[PDB]
Amino acid sequence: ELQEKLIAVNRVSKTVKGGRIFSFTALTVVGDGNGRVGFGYGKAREVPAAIQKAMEKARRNMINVALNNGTLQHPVKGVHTGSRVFMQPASEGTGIIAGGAMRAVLEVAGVHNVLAKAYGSTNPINVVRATIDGLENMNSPEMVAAKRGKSVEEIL
Template structure:
């Protein structure tokens, strides 16, 4: 369903600022530490998000009224240009579970850094992670490392989907643990991407890694 800005009636201050044009870039929201409480904010500021369903699983649990069966879905969203989110949803039917997962992924959107951090690459493009980062979820550990242009995404399919949606073209990786567990592998990769945002570096260092244009 396409988003219609005219029909949207914001319920929060941030939403109203987006609709009236006071905020025109999602980076303003991130930089000010504002909370995103309405999905329409994401739809308005990141209209080109793509969605990928990475896993659909049946989850059973015992209840006093009998066995309950739900579908658990894992979805990644991204615009392939520096923004990516990961979410999951549960419902008795696949369709509603997917919609819940997509909404959850949008609420979890982060901005990632991209650069040219490999010592053997001097292309200057924002195609890889600018430095080595680690992520963990459950038993799964993931390390993402800068790679020269042309290597591609040297990581498992789940990680490849998330990295591609974030806008990365090349990466080296190391993984350990039960990586066949999709939810943990996906969360570990996403955790590593969060670390890309958290690492503090000077402007000169960021320029040297290609994160900021010289």
């Protein structure tokens, strides 16, 4: 059921007495096609072992995003330790305007009409963790109704 997209496969190197030791990581996101995402970061000595470990680590510890039909509920800024990022709700049917790793995590996240922009540095790790932060701190109007102690047509 869960669709998964790899983003990057980097080749880290740890230097030992013999020489270098080439390892491969993997940054794969997974999600249902609606507001349930989990990113995952795996790292192993060979590539498909790393991407399978990344897929397991993403297949658990997922997220719970409440959503509109295919779009967000407000503009959000999200910052995490490399990068602040800004993603914005859109009109119905206008394409996932993002790129790099934001594109993959949002089209897995099942938002389909967004406007995003990556400020600061744009490592795939940093920007997918900041996008996950943005989808976290986004909230539904029923949630804000229950929070503020009003009704949804009283908020309008």
